[PDB]
């Protein structure tokens, strides 16, 4: 090294913040397949739903989400990200769409849980910061 300046200068990152990454709300379902569409299959984004209040909009990039996938009709990414709605009552959150899932309460609960268990995503979901 040239000089050794006293280590004062450094901050210690640990960075498992990673609500910013995914949380959203002030997008819209055309602006959240738009990252989408740059986003690998798993990859989601937590927004505000427009459509019930108190409820957030997820939005999952899914690998393929047909019964067949040979019959295609459907404009080809946007039909690949699917968009389900996080509904929380005065039990907690869920995932509008699954009727086998429970109330977790806050959404890092449910995204914590993503690889433990995707109950309503029909792929694992996965953290932009974490896989």
Same mark, same amino acid.
């Given at each position: 090294?040239?000089?050794?300046?006293?280590?004062?200068?450094?901050?210690?990152?640990?960075?498992?913040?990673?609500?910013?990454?995914?949380?959203?709300?002030?997008?819209?379902?055309?602006?959240?397949? +738009?990252?989408?569409?740059?986003? #690998? $299959?798993?990859?989601? /984004?937590? @927004?505000?739903?427009?459509?019930?209040?108190g409820?957030? %909009?997820?939005?999952?990039?899914?690998?393929?989400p047909?019964?067949? +996938?040979?019959?295609?009709?459907? #404009? $080809?990414?946007?039909? /690949?990200? @699917?968009?389900?709605?996080?509904?929380?009552?005065?039990? %907690?959150?869920?995932?509008k769409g699954?009727?086998?899932?429970?109330?977790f309460?806050?959404?890092?609960?449910?995204?914590?849980?993503?690889?433990?268990s995707?109950?309503?995503?029909?792929?694992?979901?996965?953290?932009?910061?974490?896989?």
């Amino acid at each position: 090294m040239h000089h050794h300046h006293h280590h004062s200068s450094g901050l210690v990152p640990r960075g498992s913040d990673t609500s910013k990454f995914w949380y959203k709300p002030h997008l819209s379902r055309d602006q959240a397949i +738009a990252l989408l569409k740059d986003k #690998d $299959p798993g990859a989601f /984004l937590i @927004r505000d739903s427009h459509s019930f209040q108190g409820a957030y %909009g997820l939005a999952l990039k899914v690998a393929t989400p047909p019964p067949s +996938a040979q019959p295609w009709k459907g #404009d $080809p990414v946007e039909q /690949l990200v @699917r968009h389900f709605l996080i509904e929380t009552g005065p039990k %907690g959150v869920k995932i509008k769409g699954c009727p086998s899932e429970p109330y977790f309460g806050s959404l890092s609960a449910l995204v914590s849980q993503h690889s433990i268990s995707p109950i309503s995503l029909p792929c694992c979901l996965r953290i932009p910061s974490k896989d």
